[PDB]
Nucleic acid binder design. Structure first.
Ligand SMILES: *C(=O)c1cnc2ccccc2n1
Ligand SMILES: *C(=O)c1cnc2ccccc2n1
Ligand SMILES: [Mg+2]
Ligand SMILES: [Mg+2]
Ligand SMILES: [Mg+2]
Ligand SMILES: [Mg+2]
Lengths: 10, 8
DNA sequence: AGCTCGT
DNA sequence: ACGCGCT
């Protein structure tokens, strides 16, 4: 996720 | 990712 | 494949 | 002294 907590996605 | 001082 | 902080 | 969350 995020970043943080990429995306999703990418 | 860990949160032990920052928690990002 | 795709990234990030200091208490 | 610590690595995290789905599309
Ligand atoms: C979270 O797992 C995590 C891991 N490494 C990092 C390095 C620098 C800043 C934040 C970070 N977070
Ligand atoms: C939290 O601020 C923090 C700062 N320095 C660290 C060094 C090593 C592990 C965890 C740490 N946490
Ligand atoms: Mg993969
Ligand atoms: Mg540091
Ligand atoms: Mg590390
Ligand atoms: Mg994991």
């Amino acid at each position: 996720t995020x970043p943080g907590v990429t995306x999703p996605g990418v | 990712x860990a949160x032990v001082x920052a928690x990002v």
